[model samples]
Target: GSHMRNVAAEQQLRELESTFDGRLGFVALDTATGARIAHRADERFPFCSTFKTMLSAAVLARSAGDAALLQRRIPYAKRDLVRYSPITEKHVGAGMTVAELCAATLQYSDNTAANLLIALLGGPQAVTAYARSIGDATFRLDRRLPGDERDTTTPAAMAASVRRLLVGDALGTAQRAQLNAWMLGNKTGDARIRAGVPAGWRVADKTGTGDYGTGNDIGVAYPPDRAPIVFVVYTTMRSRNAQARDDVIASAARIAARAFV
Candidate 1:
């Protein structure tokens, strides 16, 4: 039975790899067994906004189990609002709670909100230190979003960190629930991984887009009444076509869902 399962999954992954037009990296973990069941699981890729989850986790870790820390209000200045940020645009010169800023970062993929969290958590290096503390040395957050190529991580690193956050002792139950809620309700990447999966399956994910055709989606997928699957799909194209990169990610996700489920 095990041999047959491996054969079938490898075939599916081969077919999926054929559809990509650029460099592709992927990782899929069986949450129940900690088994990596798919391709290039260790390869590095520019994480983009997908690293917001780690930022949120780091903040929660700093909060020391006090929910009030997440609720503390912070002023939003005009300089804090950045292009492509819908959440911070309306609240310029006003104030938003740390929790609300986190929601904007994770759910809306707002660059301004993400930078705020990074600043509040003591800058990008702090985030990197937090990641290293949690056993993910491959992940780095040296720059703010919409900034540069300094932020990068591997599929294996992200998948393992997410699994720890969700099911391991990396976070308290309340913090885990908070992060999960933000991901489950994420408002970005409607046409990426989730587009490839069945509508009935529950997915908690974060999507990322960057220059030079960098695109990624990483998250956990919960099959109906079954264990969750933690998957990472990262892509980069020589040509600057977001749709094509997204198509590759979606295709890879569809293939994984079909084979794993």
Candidate 2:
């Protein structure tokens, strides 16, 4: 029998709130039927590495010549490089494939990889244009720092982007599948949304973490017996304790799953 969530789901989420106690926003949508449940859907959150999903799609779209012309390769200089995490093999530096760099950006949240992909895509302007063309007004690439940077996104935009990717409106079927493959390969330890689903469900997700005390995870969850769902959960806290922040996210996941199933 299909189980219906009672007040328990809401109670779980509230308890989750007590555990983390921070600013949180979330949304969940049934891709198959357009059913939705949300809280603070319009709130802005740092895209973290989740922005890389849009960048990856834009790169594929540009490479397909669907949009304006994009550069195949950019001049590589050791001096132009930026180090993100030590997880990326720093010793290896040279020309990187646009696809490989994009993969690293989404799968590993590599800052250098993201910047390189942005460069190949012609900069934040091109990425912004592509996003707008898709009617995603809430998402923008913020490549600048301090006063110069301006990129931000909302839960609605994240959900829409995932929808476009899934329907092949942004990337062709093969490209979309390829993107999903890369997403499934994501190695980030962040499991806010995925933690809510039953075991063995397929999820392709990306997370973003930044100096703004932001931690976000957005992606598609495919359960074997249920319709596919797209979910986005963003949270910000004043503390640096990683577990506290993650607990906030995990709570959102539980709510989304309970509502969705």
Candidate 3:
């Protein structure tokens, strides 16, 4: 552990890793104290579906000066559907608003919704550019859903951007409110990092579940009467055919959250 890493937290995370079969990386960043607990924070992990959060953030950023952007709608035929698109699949003939698609992408991990937004934003590289503007250099989104295991980012990079959007000036007040609102009610990540934070704290997160037994949750947690904390828990088993475990993420998050107290 060097620079921003906390030496004490690293030891605890190493002990936590010893108990798991797959690789695990996490960061529980205390914004108030500048203390960060990280394990393999610099290590690479697949984006899974987590990029939708940043994707939606990019859309929000693009829509900053245009009130019609979020309200804009794009319709597609049945051939446009991709696997696991619960939200858009339900609204095939009728189109969806950009804002609706973005929310569905984050809240449901809707594959088609993400692809639609990806195309709407021009492409994967455009989203990467948006992320770069916010100061996260390690994030990457190389493919769309049903795409590949190649898409990647690290715990350190993802958590830092969440801090930027959730607490920094990366977005306007209204846009930030909308982005947080989507993460707050997201139905996808309940069993991961959300389960680790102490009961009464508020959390907003985006989740990812894809190939290689990947299970990830990157988010912000607000403890009562204190500043919000940004935490990222990313886990992956040995291979693509390996089993995914949500508890590994939750358990490790609990360990990291303990450091903030």
Task: Report lDDT (CA) for all predictions.
Answer: 0.81, 0.70, 0.84
lDDT per residue as tens, model 1, 158-252: 88898888657788888888888889998887888888878988889999987767889998888888788887888766666544477777777
- Candidate 1 lands at a TM-score of 0.91
State candidate 3's TM-score: 0.93
lDDT of 2 by residue, 1-261 (tens): 112352455455555656554656677787666777666678776676778888888888766744223333344556655777332345345555666676778888887777777777779888888788788987877572322226677887878888788544677776788788888788883556667666667888888776546778888888888778887877766555544365567668767676766
Write one digit per residue (lDDT tens) for candidate 3, span 1-261.
234236666786787677666778788888887778888888888878888889999999988889699998889878999999888998888779998999899999899999999998899999888899999888888887222335788889988898989877799998999999999998988888888879888899998886678788988988889988898888877667766678777887787677667
TM-scores vs. true structure, each candidate: 0.91, 0.84, 0.93
Best by lDDT: 3
Q: Residue 87 CA error for candidate 3 (Å)?
A: 0.7
TM-score of 2: 0.84
Model 1 CA lDDT for position 138: 89
* Candidate order (lDDT): 3, 1, 2
- Candidate that beats the other on lDDT, 1 or 3, i.e. the better one: 3
**Candidate 3: residue 31 Cα off by (Å):** 0.6
Error of 3 at 126 (Å): 0.6
Pairs that collide in candidate 1 are none
- Pairwise TM-score winner, candidates 1 and 3: 3
